[PDB]
Amino acid sequence: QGPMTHSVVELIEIESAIIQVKMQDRTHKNAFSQELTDDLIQAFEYIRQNPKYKAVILTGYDNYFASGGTQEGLLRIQQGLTKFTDDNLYSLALDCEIPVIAAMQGHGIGGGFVMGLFADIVILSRESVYTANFMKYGFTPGMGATFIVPKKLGFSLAQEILLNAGSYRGADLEKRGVPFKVLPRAEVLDYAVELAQELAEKPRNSLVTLKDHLVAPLRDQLPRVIEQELMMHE
Amino acid sequence: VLFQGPMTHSVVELIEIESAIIQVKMQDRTHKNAFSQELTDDLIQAFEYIRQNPKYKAVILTGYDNYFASGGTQEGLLRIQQGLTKFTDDNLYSLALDCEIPVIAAMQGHGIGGGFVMGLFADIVILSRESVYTANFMKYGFTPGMGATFIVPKKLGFSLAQEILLNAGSYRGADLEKRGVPFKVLPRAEVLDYAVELAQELAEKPRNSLVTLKDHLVAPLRDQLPRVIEQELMMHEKTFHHEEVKSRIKGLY
Amino acid sequence: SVVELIEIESAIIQVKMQDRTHKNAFSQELTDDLIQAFEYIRQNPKYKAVILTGYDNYFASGGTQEGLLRIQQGLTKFTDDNLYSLALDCEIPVIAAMQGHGIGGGFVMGLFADIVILSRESVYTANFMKYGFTPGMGATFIVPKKLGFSLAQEILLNAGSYRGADLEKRGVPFKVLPRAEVLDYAVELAQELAEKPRNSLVTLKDHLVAPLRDQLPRVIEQELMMHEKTFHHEEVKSRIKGLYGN
Ligand code: NA
């Protein structure tokens, strides 16, 4: 059990084959500060260098899973200061060789919600808020949102989520028919742990061979969608 | 300052609900919002007006009382069965898809056949708990047209579309809600109020972002639809012109 | 015979799997009799709908233990005899009335029907990965096509067992009923389909499933390429010996 460089991501081994990546940039409520960006990329590179793990649980702290762009960063784009860069926090889970469970025990906002959606198994908390809120800032969505939201939540619910940038409680999404398990926040991480243990029962090579096949169309199609979304910004 | 007026046949009313929200209210009470010539012309005219006046951010398409849209008139269906007309002769099916801004289909009343299907092309669809919805084409003996074989699986998923399209059954909105559909379902008396609120939230965004985003989200729909229409017209050539379709339309309408 | 064919009303055919000795696992007898049942249906142009169902608490249980050991040894494959695609290849609509448990390839064969009904009490599982096998028989294509990409990832990667009532609460588009109502509901639905002209049912089915039928050979090849990398290890044989029927 170890912190990354900036100490705002903590890695905990749950058994020898399960790694939990806990995001805890409390100063920024797990918004994508420079420190959370570096520590997250460090976490997944460590996972990539340590093939003992068969499953990853990605989770937040307290009431926050991940909050997406920082308020400063969004403001700077809105004005004549910076532009949207492609990055690649959003696809950490997708690029991971092994199954990733996004245990979203807390709010998932903008790029934060999108990051969780690229995981193989996503669990929501009934009391938390989830929103792809890019268009509230006046901007079309980025970070692969226009691809992964319809892929995981279906075409129709994605139109509303993306065009209107509304906030949904986990309870609201459960009642609109989402395929994600939705639980009380207090139960979200235990359930992710149980499921990771069941996944760890499989040969590692079988997990990886199947995940490579299930996500090949996503890994293959995402660069083109990123280019479209950059185009939209203009 | 916020206009409200009739289209030329008076069976569609346009109301500017706010400076950037336009409501297209179908009100062919004589035909229960079936596609009479009057309703066909006034819907085309309403969507052209919207295209000619690029200041709106959302459109609400809705019916009156307990009817959203009832589809083909009996006469209209018989004209197709006879080979006088084809469903592509006017194109009501794609009105909401070809609209450059978001459209909300507030289906506060029943949605039947082409009427339900034209609604399903909207970007956001809301159903009423107590209304009936049906892609009822196959009850008359002929295959679904109006792009139904494309937009039903796209919006409600492959599996539920199989059953809705092959069996032509009628579902309450509550039935579809229990089946797991991603559309918001509400008591009829709340459907339009909820559509207006959602249109108000959409109107908080810049119009150019909405149009840019919609173009990107529905590009596959606009790209893929024409081929499926061709295929549906070939299915009609195989199924619509049998004598028993005439007997079913006259007997079961 | 472990498959019984029963006509219902004029144009409905029920295919009833009742290999009670094997709990509707794919014994040699069930395999041969299912193939013959669907060939009889293929040669008979009276029928307008098929009801595929099992007996008591079993819909279809997938490979026998010796069958899975044959696959692990490389003597046979999950796709042999193309049982997995019988309902897709059938020219008329098929209803899988899964009044009982659906396990492994028995589940997947049912999921290629045009309409699938589950029972609340019964267990459903694409359980290939419990043994170390990657999913075969078109599972990687028909589970996401039928139940959506997200739910399919969890079903296929983890090989878990779900009650019909658990899937119902996760949001599946299938009708889920008490077991004692499943076949009665399938019969009402089949009478409703039988109201349509047969030529209309066939013409529309051919269209709605053309993408499945066109893409499925590609997907089968992709599954075979996964299976080459995964099926022949020793620990797949121990898993089959230790976990079968657990
Ligand atoms: Na004809």
Author numbering:
A (entry chain C): -2 to 231
B (entry chain A): -5 to 247
C (entry chain B): 4 to 249
Pull text from the paper:
There is a single active site per PksI monomer, with each active site positioned on the periphery of the trimer, ~ 43 Å from one other.
Two crystal structures of PksI were elucidated; the first to 1.93 Å resolution using a crystal cryoprotected in glycerol (PksI_GOL), and the second to 2.1 Å using a crystal cryoprotected using ethylene glycol (PksI_EG). The final model of PksI_GOL comprises residues 1–247 of chain A, residues 4–249 of chain B and residues 3–231 of chain C, 663 water molecules, 6 glycerol molecules and 1 HEPES molecule. In the PksI_GOL structure a single monomer (chain A) within the PksI trimer possess a bound glycerol molecule within its active site. In the unliganded structure, the active site adopts an “closed” conformation, with the side chains of Phe136 and Phe81 pointing directly into the centre of the active site cavity and His230 rotated to face away from the central chamber. In this “open” conformation the side chains of Phe136 and Phe81 are seen to flip away from the centre of the active site, which is occupied by the bound glycerol molecule. As a consequence, Phe136 forms a tripartite stacking interaction with Phe234 and His235, which sits beneath the proposed catalytic residue His230, which itself rotates to point directly into the centre of the active site. It is likely that our unliganded structure represents the ground state of the enzyme, with the glycerol bound form equating to a mimic of a PksI reaction intermediate. The observed side chain rearrangements in the glycerol bound structure are essential for allowing the substrate to be accommodated within the catalytic site of the enzyme and may also function to promote active site solvation, consistent with a potential role for water as a proton donor during catalysis.
